Amino acid sequence: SVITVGPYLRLHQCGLPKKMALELFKPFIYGKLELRGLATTIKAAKKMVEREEAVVWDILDEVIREHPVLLNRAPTLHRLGIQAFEPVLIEGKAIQLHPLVCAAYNADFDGDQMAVHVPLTLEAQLEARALMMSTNNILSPANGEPIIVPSQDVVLGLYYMTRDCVNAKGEGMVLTGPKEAERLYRSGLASLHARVKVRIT
Amino acid sequence: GQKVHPNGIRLGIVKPWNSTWFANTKEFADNLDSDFKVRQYLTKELAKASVSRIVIERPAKSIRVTIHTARPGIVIGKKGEDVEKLRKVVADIAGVPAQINIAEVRKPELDAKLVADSITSQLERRVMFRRAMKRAVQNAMRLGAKGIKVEVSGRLGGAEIARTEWYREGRVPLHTLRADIDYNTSEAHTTYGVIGVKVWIFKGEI
Amino acid sequence: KPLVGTGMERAVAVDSGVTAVAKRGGVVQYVDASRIVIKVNEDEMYPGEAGIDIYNLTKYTRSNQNTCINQMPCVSLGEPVERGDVLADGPSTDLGELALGQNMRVAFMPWNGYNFEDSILVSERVVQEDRFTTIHIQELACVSRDTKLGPEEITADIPNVGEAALSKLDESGIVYIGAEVTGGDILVGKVTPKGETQLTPEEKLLRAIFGEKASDVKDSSLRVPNGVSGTVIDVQVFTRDGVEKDKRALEIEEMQLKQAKKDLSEELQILEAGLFSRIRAVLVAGGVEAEKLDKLPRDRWLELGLTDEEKQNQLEQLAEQYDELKHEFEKKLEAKRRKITQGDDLAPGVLKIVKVYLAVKRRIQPGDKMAGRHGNKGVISKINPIEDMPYDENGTPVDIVLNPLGVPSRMNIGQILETHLGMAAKGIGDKINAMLKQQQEVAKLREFIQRAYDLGADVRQKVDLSTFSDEEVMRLAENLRKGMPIATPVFDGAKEAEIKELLKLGDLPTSGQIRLYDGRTGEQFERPVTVGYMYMLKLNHLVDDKM
Amino acid sequence: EFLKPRLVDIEQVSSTHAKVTLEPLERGFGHTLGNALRRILLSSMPGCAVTEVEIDGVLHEYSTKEGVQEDILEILLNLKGLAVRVQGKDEVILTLNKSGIGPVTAADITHDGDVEIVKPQHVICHLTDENASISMRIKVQRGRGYVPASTRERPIGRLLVDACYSPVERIAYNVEAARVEQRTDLDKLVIEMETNGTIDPEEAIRRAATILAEQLEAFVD
Amino acid sequence: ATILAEQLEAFV
Amino acid sequence: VTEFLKPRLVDIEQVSSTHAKVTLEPLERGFGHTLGNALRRILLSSMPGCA
Amino acid sequence: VYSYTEKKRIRKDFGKRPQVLDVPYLLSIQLDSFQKFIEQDPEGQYGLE
Amino acid sequence: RIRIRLKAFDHRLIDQATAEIVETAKRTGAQVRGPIPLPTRKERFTVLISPHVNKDARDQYEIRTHLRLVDIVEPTEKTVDALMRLDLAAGVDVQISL
Amino acid sequence: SAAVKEFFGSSQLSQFMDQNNPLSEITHKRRISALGPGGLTRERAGFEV
């Protein structure tokens, strides 16, 4: 499906829609439904998820938990173009992908699409968590340079934050810690760039 | 002389009446006249339409018929065009605009009327009546209705002497008016007699 | 409409074939959502073939890309039209212009990461107004082939299907027009996959059912899959000749016979009405009968007192035209009954083809692709509530929050000039709305519209409202109150100082940037941000077609 | 000992929108109560919009009716924009009958007395022949927020429009200095709302304060 | 919460 | 129509000392920000004290 | 003077260069070529001829 | 002086009918004396059930009858206006004696 | 009929019109394609053309 941002996520997890999640995890949901005792034969379970009753979404949040998926950009050139995430379910129809990870995939958001793959067996879940997890790929294998470098909005937010101007609100006042620095920025008594002696530890 | 209807003793307290509208004694007649003979013409055409109950509520200078089937589409014929054909043959009879409510059921096979004419729809050609009933009885048992006692009558098996038997499965209330059980009856007139049917299908309670 | 166009919209709209251009000008007689009747002016009109034109518009039908090629009438009744002029707008047109997408209130600011690379963040005010809600139409075909053990069945006589599937079907299998279906119901019932099934001991008892020898062939009704909703708007049934027409196919045959009968009879009635209006127009002079004209039946308006002139010659020519219309109507109704009644040549071994048109209405959701007209793409990433939007010190929330960082690298600086000039256009539109909502007389409206139409260097337009006569100015302001359209040709466009002078005519700030408050915190964004109107397009790379 | 806000002046400057005033307020509470009441008024207020329409000779909403120059879809949009007040009724069914050349305004609805149209000049459609008449039934109900058609019809003749149960349009507060009280460093909160006529402004500010004080009941005594 | 609730007892 | 999702403090995970972390659920699709902003602005200044 | 649908909503127009040749009929390649193809004209000039 | 009599059979359906017409009247006129009932009315009939014999099988049925009177106090040109062609109770006989 | 029906039916230049916009019609009809019979493909063309 088509990707989109979702900046609330951590680099280890990605958003994955509920409709795709109920289609990719049909046998795990069948096994979970047969374990509880809600149904009997396999047919009954396929009718239950064909109807999508109120009880299969709790079953789905049980199988998605601690089960990584392989996200994959379609022109995969190096090994950082297949990375394993943990799903977080999405009301929607678009894969929410953590932004820093985009600089690894060469993925902008101008109409891109990605494929999800499910590690079925248990050794494959452990390979997705222990080798291919997105927290494990923070350095590019071609060199020593970090590949989870902050790309474009966040460096503008930092460059506007840590800068200075020759006069602002609270020029040259003295502050007993960084906590009241943020308290002076939020209350409206100083500016985000106003030079100040602080006491840092 | 046995077997009172649990229907007629329980109408209104648990299950709504099959007609509800006011009339005086003087206009008790003309209100009554319309009800029978058009339901006669309703049961002539919608016999194959799998209908459950026909409550006719006709207010003063008004008439509404709540048709309760499970396959309405076939009745409408096409975009509710035959529905007006039910309406044109009733408007110039009772002289009042008779509006038609085809309010359907989602579940046909849990109905007292449908199981009654089920064997009757297949009685014309000689069937072993037990398996014919058993199928519907089991289907209606596993589908949630917790009690069934089902009847057939006539001269079953091409018989001559009197024969009747019933198949008990579940709860049958006839001394507890609180619980929920229905009953209907149709007939099968053919080249060998009238081979009849009753049923007592139990739904539930308060 | 585009608030900031190039004036090239009318060439692309009229010189294509989606609008209903008038052939001969005149006076409109009957507007309807189906048809439009023009009465042709007398200084454009043939002597014979009396002539009032009928435009049969093309209502909701399938395009090639599953869009909805509609035509809407845009003229009033009694309205004059000129030769070479639009009567019915088409798809993505408006009053003869070319309106592809819609124009919305945009702000360039980073907003909490939800527009990170190229993404777009849209208020719920956009989806509440039903303004990107596009209408798609899918065609679903079902053929009745010819195989072994016999032909197929389209009838609804089918087992297994509960009285829940068949409630949405007609007694003859086809879904009736208007039934709003879901993903996975039955549209056309077709008992066809007939395989084999054993019946040994346990199932041998199942052979002693209703006397039926054995249930070997798999009773099964061709049911359809899921993924799409819709509303069945149109059903076609084609029958290879020789095959028995069922009751639905005879319904459609009676329906189209009735439609074509009514349509050709209205052709004869409308052209006969124009012909009798010509007879009344001729008999104004030369043996006029003011009272004696409507005492006799109307089909004999020829034997009245009038000598051998051009007028009796013209009444003879109109009698020739009338008898031609009579015999032509006879032979054409016979040929049209032949075309409806006949079969159609079809595939080798097919009985009948049923085509059903579902009409989905796809709104907008996180994952669709929107884009402006300069290359600023983007997957819309979060459909915010109304309250969270950055508003200004008037009260109005902005609709869409783009990302500023796409401008210095991807060098499309034209979108910011388009944004500022769109805000100027809407400032003029808001001042017209303020001067009209207060019920002001036409003098002040004339003053302000004249000042907004002069406003520039040596330009080409040079209009004056002193020849519009106090009723068109109110209707022109009725059309300008949602904004004033501005043409900007390609390489000879509006310079910066003209945009500044037009932003000075409205009471907007000169630099184009309003200070904007926040919706969450309720406290002001520092360093005032750019708002305006950008004309943004929805592209048909949707997300519930790729997922 | 905080000074408490009391409503002082309700300037009904036009028929749609008004300017209520919260006075007085210690410094800091101006922006707090302003943003809070703005966000409650835009979020969830009880409106009275429309849900179902049944035009008589119309099967599906994509058809066309003989004798009206707009489609049935455009009639549904024009009825979606209908501004109507109901009095002590969950839902209500309005009836419309109109015949003759000209517009079908919103004042042609047979009003049930308790139902009150607030803008009777609202055009729905244009009839365009001498014998060509529409006759529809409209269903208007209470609600809260935006309830579309895809979330929530049994015959084929009903038509479901979307439901924008929201009476207000634009809420703008402007804090300003106070001088009525001799004490300085006090503030005035002036809220210009923008109603569509279905909600009284003091009733709107009262329901917003009730909703917010209900939300703070989770951790107040 | 007590301060904010005491600042709304003249409305509800 | 005046019936909302009345919330509650499901837990007070007071991390260590002189520091708490109070989570409140469930609120409407928009009331988390208005209660966070109201409580944040009032605690910052309105709250009195001595120093 | 303006046509009657150009008095509905007259678009404001910037622009400085006074035009001298209006935009031609944009579909003239297709229509003119196929009119050149099928048209009763012998001397071996028309497409089929 | 203005009487609104309501005539039906059961008290289990007229009970919502006396609620709909005092409150919708309050909305408009707000002028009513309150519902004053009438004694419940009974029509019992013993009937023979055996087809051709046996004068012992008499089963008691009854068409029950109930009447409730609303009696708005003042002739209001708003109560009658809003509640003219309006009555929630279905299959009922309304008697708006003005 | 086989020759002219094969050309209008399936050629490399008799292509399916994208009907979804008046602009897309009027700019698909005005197209100067270099491909087809008597031209090249995406693999043959270099940088000059």
Side-chain angles (χ1 to χ4, degrees), chain B residues 6-206:
Chain B
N7 181 275
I9 202 57
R10 288 170 306 137
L11 292 194
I13 39 176
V14 283
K15 294 182 192 306
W17 279 286
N18 181 58
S19 83
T20 36
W21 33 265
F22 194 77
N24 183 10
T25 43
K26 279 204 197 319
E27 63 264 16
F28 203 87
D30 45 1
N31 265 348
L32 177 56
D33 295 330
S34 195
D35 176 76
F36 284 6
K37 56 174 188 277
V38 187
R39 275 197 234 198
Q40 150 67 51
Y41 200 63
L42 169 62
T43 49
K44 173 60 65 60
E45 296 296 273
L46 274 76
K48 293 158 300 306
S50 52
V51 206
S52 171
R53 69 184 296 168
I54 309 295
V55 184
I56 297 189
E57 20 204 280
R58 6 137 48 91
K61 232 259 106 250
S62 183
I63 158 164
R64 250 180 64 248
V65 35
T66 71
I67 296 185
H68 184 202
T69 183
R71 214 183 339 109
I74 62 111
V75 187
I76 93 190
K78 231 242 278 258
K79 332 130 343 265
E81 109 246 84
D82 299 352
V83 178
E84 183 48 57
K85 296 161 190 305
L86 271 92
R87 202 188 323 263
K88 62 198 55 163
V89 306
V90 70
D92 76 277
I93 294 308
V96 182
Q99 304 322 294
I100 167 178
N101 322 288
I102 314 162
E104 70 172 357
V105 62
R106 74 274 184 193
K107 37 172 56 60
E109 314 105 303
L110 298 92
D111 184 69
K113 187 55 200 192
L114 186 48
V115 58
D117 49 4
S118 63
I119 170 63
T120 317
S121 60
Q122 314 306 137
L123 253 171
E124 324 298 318
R125 281 141 295 172
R126 290 314 301 166
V127 65
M128 188 50 243
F129 38 81
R130 167 211 31 102
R131 198 100 188 280
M133 287 152 92
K134 249 52 230 101
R135 241 57 157 281
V137 175
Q138 173 57 53
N139 289 142
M141 199 283 315
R142 57 157 196 158
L143 260 60
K146 312 170 279 167
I148 174 66
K149 255 186 162 176
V150 53
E151 190 274 343
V152 287
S153 84
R155 275 157 30 218
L156 50 93
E160 307 319 301
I161 56 186
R163 275 167 186 185
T164 311
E165 205 48 55
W166 34 263
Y167 290 165
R168 182 211 88 87
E169 185 156 13
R171 324 199 41 90
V172 169
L174 184 150
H175 281 103
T176 304
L177 269 69
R178 176 187 33 90
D180 315 329
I181 171 152
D182 291 9
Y183 150 78
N184 287 306
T185 293
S186 195
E187 307 305 337
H189 98 295
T190 189
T191 190
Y192 282 106
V194 169
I195 302 104
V197 65
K198 300 160 168 155
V199 80
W200 272 272
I201 179 61
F202 167 72
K203 299 163 281 314
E205 295 89 359
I206 208 180

Side-chain angles (χ1 to χ4, degrees), chain A residues 1-192:
Chain A
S1 70
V2 185
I3 61 171
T4 189
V5 183
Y8 62 96
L9 297 151
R10 308 158 62 189
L11 41 129
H12 85 112
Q13 70 189 358
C14 74
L16 195 142
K18 284 185 180 292
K19 299 181 180 181
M20 296 173 68
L22 199 143
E23 185 66 33
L24 294 172
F25 288 0
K26 287 172 77 65
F28 308 101
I29 288 171
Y30 291 162
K32 275 295 290 147
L33 222 169
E34 120 134 347
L35 196 28
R36 304 206 161 300
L38 290 26
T40 316
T41 164
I42 170 95
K43 239 256 340 166
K46 194 179 288 185
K47 289 183 289 184
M48 287 179 70
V49 302
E50 182 180 359
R51 186 178 293 113
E52 294 178 355
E53 289 181 353
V55 298
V56 296
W57 301 106
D58 294 334
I59 296 295
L60 207 152
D61 286 332
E62 265 133 39
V63 288
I64 282 260
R65 218 237 142 149
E66 296 327 289
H67 193 186
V69 298
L70 271 65
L71 265 76
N72 177 204
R73 228 207 115 211
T76 297
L77 274 81
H78 64 292
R79 77 174 190 179
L80 304 178
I82 297 176
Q83 296 180 4
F85 296 99
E86 291 177 354
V88 174
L89 276 76
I90 292 302
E91 288 291 328
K93 290 176 184 176
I95 292 169
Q96 292 186 353
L97 181 69
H98 184 80
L100 302 176
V101 179
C102 298
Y105 283 107
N106 198 1
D108 53 351
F109 294 101
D110 53 359
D112 292 23
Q113 300 179 2
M114 289 175 77
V116 289
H117 299 286
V118 176
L120 295 184
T121 187
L122 191 57
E123 297 88 5
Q125 298 183 2
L126 276 165
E127 285 178 353
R129 191 173 296 281
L131 291 172
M132 298 170 62
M133 200 76 192
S134 181
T135 52
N136 291 320
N137 287 325
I138 68 164
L139 300 174
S140 179
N143 44 6
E145 293 186 356
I147 205 65
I148 308 299
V149 64
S151 296
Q152 73 184 14
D153 275 322
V154 42
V155 291
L156 183 62
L158 266 78
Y159 184 76
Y160 184 73
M161 176 172 64
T162 161
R163 202 175 163 180
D164 53 353
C165 59
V166 79
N167 193 4
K169 292 184 180 181
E171 173 73 23
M173 64 183 296
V174 290
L175 270 59
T176 183
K179 298 178 183 180
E180 77 165 357
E182 194 179 3
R183 183 174 64 186
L184 285 180
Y185 172 65
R186 293 288 183 179
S187 64
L189 300 172
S191 176
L192 182 55

